[PDB]
């Protein structure tokens, strides 16, 4: 029903987030709030026509995230049960 | 009292009068400037006034370093790898130093981003045609010893020793 409870239970997983400006940040999801505030640690960000930069921490808002990319070994069938 | 990581981590850091992040490292009497990797290029200015540094070298790669205060020291030689470690170095205050010859200003020509240089209160400034040699060797510098470089001084520097 609510996607925020499913996104909050995806902690300690290496995922990727593509923004609306073409910047893709790949990192381990460590913190998710009700407003989809993605706080990741040891992330790598690649902007549009720029070099990738590695950061120890990153905080991306929910309104600035356009798409997400999860690994194929993620238990989406078990995490969907509330 | 050498410059270490514990001395840089315990030093005060704040905002200067030009709204830049400056760390006050004065009153330490460091004989050699080293172990600057603990700052991780988080400071825009370096306040190393009233020290005992003999050579301005041994600095790591810091792209955010734009101002360097080396006043009231005994700096007599400049390192040749200053451009590879500070590409954005624009302010260099070397007043009251131990520079005696103009040949120490030859590694200072590699800093293309340097625009403000201070070489006052030095025996190298008392030599003949020191300002013309500093204008000819460093054309990127616009302000030398709190004086704006004019076109006539550039023409006089380009005429002699061509």
């Amino acid at each position: 029903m609510k996607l925020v409870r499913f996104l909050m239970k995806l902690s300690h997983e290496t995922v990727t987030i593509e923004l609306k400006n073409g910047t893709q940040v790949h990192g381990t999801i460590t913190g998710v709030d009700v407003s989809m505030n993605t706080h990741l640690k040891a992330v790598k960000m690649t902007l549009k026509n720029r070099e990738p930069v590695q950061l120890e921490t990153l905080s991306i808002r929910g309104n600035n995230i356009r798409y997400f990319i999860l690994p194929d070994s993620l238990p989406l069938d078990t995490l969907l049960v509330d | 009292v050498k410059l270490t990581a514990e001395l840089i981590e315990q030093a005060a850091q704040y905002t200067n009068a030009v709204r830049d992040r400056e760390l006050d490292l004065r009153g330490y009497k460091i004989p050699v400037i080293e172990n600057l990797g603990a700052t991780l290029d988080q400071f825009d200015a370096i306040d190393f006034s009233d020290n005992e540094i003999r050579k301005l070298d041994g600095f790591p790669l810091l792209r955010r370093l734009k101002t360097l205060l080396v006043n009231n020291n005994r700096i007599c030689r400049i390192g040749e790898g200053l451009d590879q470690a500070l590409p954005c170095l624009t302010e260099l205050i070397l007043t009251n130093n131990s520079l005696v010859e103009l040949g120490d200003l030859d590694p200072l020509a590699s800093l293309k981003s340097l625009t403000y240089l201070s070489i006052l209160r030095n025996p190298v400034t008392n030599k003949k045609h020191y300002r013309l040699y500093v204008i000819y060797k460093v054309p990127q510098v616009r302000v030398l010893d709190f004086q704006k470089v004019k076109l006539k001084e550039r023409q006089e520097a380009e005429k002699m020793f061509k």
């Binding site: - | 200067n16 009068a17 030009v18 006050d24 004065r26 306040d47 006034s49 205060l69 006043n71 009231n72 302010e91 205050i93 007043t95 009251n96 403000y116 201070s118 302000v143 709190f146 004086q147 704006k148």
Partner: protein
């Protein structure tokens, strides 16, 4: 004019930019001490003038004495003491051991003598046209005797400080 932490320089070149002149004044004042603030305006009332407020009053006095009449951007700037106190300094604020003083003004209170002796570090006590100032340190008392020998305070008379005898 009493010495303060803020030194005001005037008769400078007003054709340069405000930020470049402020950076040049900060680079000039960094050789004498830590510059806490730099007040520089370019309006019709404050044209061609600026001021630097430092942490210590001795560094500001040395910068006013050394750079008196120094050529700054083609024009020799004149440095002097500030009339009032700075706002940042007001926000941040709120041989022998005994020295003999002669030809002291009788209208000066103990607070003015304490503010005059505050250039040296903390002393033991003060005694009040003759006065006796005793410091806790010998080197601080020697520096206070060497500094107050002909100081510029109450210029109608001349103050003389000498070391006490046994």
């Amino acid at each position: 004019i009493r010495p303060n932490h803020t030194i005001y320089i005037n008769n400078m070149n007003d054709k340069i930019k405000k930020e470049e002149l402020k950076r040049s004044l900060y680079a000039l004042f960094s050789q004498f001490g830590h510059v806490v603030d730099i007040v520089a305006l370019k309006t019709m009332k404050m044209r061609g003038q600026a001021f630097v407020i430092f942490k210590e009053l001795g560094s500001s006095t040395n910068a006013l004495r050394q750079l008196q009449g120094f050529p700054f951007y083609g024009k020799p700037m004149r440095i002097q003491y500030a009339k009032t106190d700075s706002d940042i300094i007001s926000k941040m604020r709120g041989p022998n051991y005994i020295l003999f003083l002669n030809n002291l003004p009788e209208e000066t209170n103990e607070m003015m003598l304490s503010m005059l002796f505050n250039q040296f570090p903390g002393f033991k006590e003060v005694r009040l046209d003759i006065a006796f100032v005793e410091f806790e340190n010998d080197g601080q008392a020697g520096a206070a005797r060497d500094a107050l020998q002909g100081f510029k305070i109450t210029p109608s008379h001349a103050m003389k400080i000498t070391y006490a005898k046994k």
